[PDB]
Design an enzyme around this catalytic site. Structure first.
Site, short mmCIF file in Angstrom:
data_model
loop_
_atom_site.label_atom_id
_atom_site.label_comp_id
_atom_site.label_asym_id
_atom_site.label_seq_id
_atom_site.Cartn_x
_atom_site.Cartn_y
_atom_site.Cartn_z
CE1 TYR A 125 1.06 -1.30 4.39
CE2 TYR A 125 0.16 1.29 4.67
CZ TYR A 125 0.56 -0.09 5.10
OH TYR A 125 1.29 0.03 6.37
CG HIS A 179 6.67 2.43 13.33
ND1 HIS A 179 5.03 2.04 13.14
CD2 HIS A 179 7.03 1.29 12.51
CE1 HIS A 179 5.12 1.34 12.27
NE2 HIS A 179 6.26 1.05 11.74
#
Ligand code: NA
Lengths: 218, 222, 222, 223, 219
Positions: free
Chosen positions: D125, D148
């Site tokens: 994506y 993250h």
């Protein structure tokens, strides 16, 4: 003084004929008669693969919008034109700059067109043009300072208010594709980035003369 | 007065299916016969405009107005039956209607005033912010006044601004005319400095092109 | 009388594939025959409407209602098998269901009050802001009441506000009817001054057109 | 150190069937395998071909290829479109990206460049950050990206390919996650919703998720 | 701890079906039976026509792997009925344990019977929803379940779909009375979780039908 510039993007309807003999020469002949009529073909570009919905871009300019409209329609009567669907076609007009009136688009400075181009439209925030001229001056000045480390990628920023859906059309040219990428990413640290509403579609491709372009398309 | 006349105006935008035939002999003649048959003292054709090149998804626009929306619908369908209409795909067709202004009641659109159309046109729909019409009247009046002032230097650019609430997806349809196209772009850029720009939600698509009689228009199209 | 009675409403919008044949002989007759059979099952066609010209991507609307959604689905498919149906492409078809109002439970849609259909319609879906339904009941009541108050200058414009939660992409479908099209425009413009306009998320597409007998409608299409 | 100093372009090209392949499709996969063999003789790497059918309506097949120049991939794209299978397909979405060194951890190398082997499932994506992400104090970005990768630590079987794509298309990064268990990609993505960087996101659609297959099996299973 | 993938595949007619369509539903039913012998379950076929201009048919099917559902989808597209259809929207989800109320699973995994009507739609929450302190989320989801307790006849199917497509959740509501889906959805607009929504469109709502009846009713 007055120069209109048009970027016209096309997609293949399906593929070209296996034998496409007269295709590129008909287009080259048209390009030759248009140059005689003061319409400059700055480049044709192979966009295929980098976009699913686009294969070819023509960059042309002239003294009136009307001459570019005629060239556009003449190209579509061509065998190559009849194998293509228009996708995106947007005109811009060179006007004087707000602050640094030395900034002239690369195409207007008779600079050589480079091997790679990245073209995209641009729309600023609603309040950008309502800021104090002092604030707009500082951010644009920063904008050119950070760009100063990429003199090998040439800028073409042209006004397009009222000719289409946008405010500016931008076209960056460079002989190495990764330099446009790095500049664009570097310019993300500009504080003028807080004043953006739209900047797509991006059409990025490889400058080719029409013979080779026709030969390499599916 | 002329603010109590009802006059609907329609802008109909079409795109070539492909190209016109190499042999297009009766094409522009049939449409011209329709036009003055339509003009039989009822449906006015203010202009036909060549949009090709300036956008990929459009080639010609018809600007017509009449006393009732019903007449414009009939005209629309009659045009689609011509040879030219059958070579075209409808793209965008929006109707509007002069309603008396909120503040300056002598701003009449150029078409309802019977003024001569100019060489170039730029038409786009317009939707204001949700609270524009909620503002104090004087706030709106001042911004619109500041806006009229910012246009003082472009008397050569004629503005049509016409209400379209509930006739389509928009609130107003705008149409600017000028003999020199670069004056429309300069006016637009200058008007970005107007305080009413903080009360805008939508203002595309833009359809911009060259007024042409249907003969030269049909000849120059692909 | 009956808020507990179930009535589903459907507005089905279609676009010409191209153009009708020049000999469109039994097109309207087949559709009228179908509509009379549907009326036998108490599936009522409130109107068929000419949208052409006011929209580039639509030409015809059918407004039908019935006691179940299933019956309206059957009618839709039956219509698509007629000659006229095979010349059209579906564009937008949205169902709603009358549900008792939140406060003014005396609000009944015009199609449920035996009001005859007016000559013009404007139909659009509607989605409120996320917090509209979370406001204190009285703030919602006040805004809904004032909006009713601003609308009483236009008693010739009949409202049809019908819930559509979970039948499609929207929360309400609205349909305004008036014998004069310019009165729908003026009402819409006036209601922009309503405080509830701060609680809007979506209100397009607008489908506006002229009510017509199916025979005259088939005749006037391209 | 010459890891991010090389130049490798990568392209994900998505196609939709025009309708259906013919019942007799005897040579379709063979022609494509030939081309893929020829392209390998050109230093164009087909990392994988993926079946996207069923998981979305508007896409059936994805090709992941990479090479030293954008030009080489353009040529390969057009060559594929001339095959019989290519002529039964409609281009849907084709986006290029280019490995550049990461802002903070130059030890983040996309899996395909670390020459890891391709897993059974992929999720691809594009990505666009908020306008102000690149304007933040370098500490805040460092912290949120460190936040993250720390949360991604519970999913070492899911391999990441985050590649810059500024001015090659409409986006800033293209991401491709690979795992042999599809459900692990799902759980990774859900878990990463608790990351502070989620406050700095503008676009992350379309998702093209599918199953890696040899071209022969791909062709035989398509409608 | 079970893995079950669930797929909703939506199609629209290319134009209409042949007036004579005698073998269409039969062929599809044979395929459905052959798939049942591979533990691919068809939970229903649904008539969407009329409620949607760009959709006519939905198939809801679930299996132990994504791959089985791909094969089934392509097999369907080979049938005569499949050849008369255009794919519109086809989205997969995967049941994953709930963050708080682990006592709730989707109706189709609890094998209860499918109802007359369905309403299916995808869902994307706000960017900060998953960043809220666990108690804020827990409160909002808890109150929202309380608001729905007045509609036990509407069965819920909430299934995670992160990275399988463009969304975060796929929701499917089943009920024997369509107006009860409308009323529940209206009621739930007063839930504080409505402040944390980014997308919930398209809605595909329709009537459960056997394939024979469904093929005969389509234009
Ligand atoms: Na692209």
């Amino acid at each position: 003084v007055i120069r209109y510039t048009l970027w016209s993007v096309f997609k293949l309807k399906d593929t070209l004929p296996e034998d496409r003999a007269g295709y590129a020469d008909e287009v080259q002949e048209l390009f030759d008669q248009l140059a005689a009529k003061d319409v400059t073909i700055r480049g044709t570009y192979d966009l295929s693969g980098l976009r699913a919905d686009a294969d070819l871009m023509i960059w042309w300019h002239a003294e009136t919008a009307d001459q570019l409209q005629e060239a556009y329609n003449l190209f579509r009567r061509t065998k190559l034109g009849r194998a293509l669907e228009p996708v995106w076609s947007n005109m811009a007009l060179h006007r004087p700059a707000e602050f640094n009136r030395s900034h002239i688009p690369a195409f207007l400075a008779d600079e050589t067109p480079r091997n790679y181009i990245s073209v995209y439209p641009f729309v600023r925030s609603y309040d950008w043009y309502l800021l104090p001229d002092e604030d707009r001056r500082r951010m644009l000045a920063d904008h050119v300072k950070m760009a100063r480390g990429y003199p090998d990628v040439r800028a073409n920023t042209v006004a397009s208010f009222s000719l289409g859906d946008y405010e500016w059309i931008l076209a960056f040219e460079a002989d190495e594709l990764h330099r446009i990428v790095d500049l664009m990413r570097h310019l993300r640290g500009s504080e003028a980035r807080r004043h953006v509403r739209e900047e797509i579609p991006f059409y990025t491709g490889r400058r080719k003369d029409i013979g080779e372009l026709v030969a390499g398309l599916a």
